[PDB]
Amino acid sequence: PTIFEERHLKYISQLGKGNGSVELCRYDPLGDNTGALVAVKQLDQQRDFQREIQILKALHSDFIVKYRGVSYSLRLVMEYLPSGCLRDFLQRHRARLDASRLLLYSSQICKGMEYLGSRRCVHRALAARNILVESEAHVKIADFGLAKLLPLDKDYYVVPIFWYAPESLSDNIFSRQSDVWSFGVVLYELFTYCDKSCSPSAEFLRMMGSERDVPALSRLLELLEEGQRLPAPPACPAEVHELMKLCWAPSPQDRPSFSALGPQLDMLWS
């Protein structure tokens, strides 16, 4: 929880890039390569980094990536999770992993989302690509770039689409209930071991009979209105598929809470 002097941050590698980049650095004030490793995020967006840091300063959970401080143009310094993105990890260790492990990860993501809910924080971005793996036994939620704190008196706000709840698609509405819908897509992703051919984009594009890279918002809404949903992945226990279907109830108030999904996933693992 400190200001990291830029001169002491020794660049190791680029971890990711998007809309924005995350760099693996060694914080070496001594200058003898004994210092701890950190992940440094760097970028009209002064308002957005101000928004993101205010949220991250306030989160303290073993299931949410730890905010470590700042460095300087504002840079955000976070803990580094050595096993990287869940999407990469599941694809590389598929043969060595099992349904038990995916239930353990599902339970941990659900605990972090319960915590975010307790802070009236909407994550919005939740997807396997922003879940990070600390160790074989532990994952954490990352990417707070689109996160938002709800007002005290309003449980929603108005702002890829394959993780979004229908109200987000049709009315630009986001809430903790739309985060539950996205969590259902994450459960789907975990159970495919993040396989590219069965990704939410690949599967929804097949279901919609699309012959293009970019989906049509109107067609996805039509498919969802019909009651169509992502199928149960081959590796998927029937119990988990039922939980996904609940997260995907068309009305937000009819979706389960993370506090209700959580013990169920925990038990399936245990």
Ligand X SMILES: */C=C\C(=O)Nc1ccc2ncn(-c3cncc(Nc4ccccc4)n3)c2c1
Residues of this chain that bind ligand X (CB under 6 A): 15-16, 22, 39, 41, 65, 78, 80-81, 84-85, 88, 129-130, 132, 142-143
Answer yes or no: are the C-beta atoms of 59 and 121 closer than 8 Å: yes
Half-sphere exposure of 77 (CA within 13 A, CB side): 22
Considering beta carbons, is residue 129 or 148 the nearer one to ligand X? 129
Considering beta carbons, is residue 23 or 167 the nearer one to ligand X? 23
> What is d(CA 12, CA 37) in angstroms, rounded to the nearest whole number?
9
Could you tell me the smallest distance in angstroms from the CB atom of residue 43 to ligand X?
12
* DSSP code per residue over 250-270: SSGGGSPPHHHHHHHHHHHH-
Question: DSSP class of residue 208?
Answer: T
Quick count: other Cβ atoms within 10 Å of Cβ 173?
Answer: 18
Could you tell me the smallest distance in angstroms from the CB atom of residue 35 to ligand X?
16
Q: What are φ and ψ of residue 21, in 5° steps?
A: -150, 155
Q: Which residues pair with 156 in a beta bridge?
A: 175
Considering beta carbons, is residue 65 or 268 the nearer one to ligand X? 65
Half-sphere exposure of 75 (CA within 13 A, CB side): 20
Considering beta carbons, is residue 65 or 236 the nearer one to ligand X? 65
Could you tell me the smallest distance in angstroms from the CB atom of residue 112 to ligand X?
14
Could you tell me the smallest distance in angstroms from the CB atom of residue 5 to ligand X?
19
Number of residue whose CB is nearest ligand X = 85
What 3-state DSSP class applies to 99? helix
Q: Which of 98, 101, 38 is nearest to 71 (CA)?
A: 38
Considering beta carbons, is residue 15 or 139 the nearer one to ligand X? 15
Could you tell me the smallest distance in angstroms from the CB atom of residue 236 to ligand X?
24
Considering beta carbons, is residue 35 or 84 the nearer one to ligand X? 84
Could you tell me the smallest distance in angstroms from the CB atom of residue 85 to ligand X?
3
Answer yes or no: are the C-beta atoms of 39 and 79 closer than 8 Å: yes
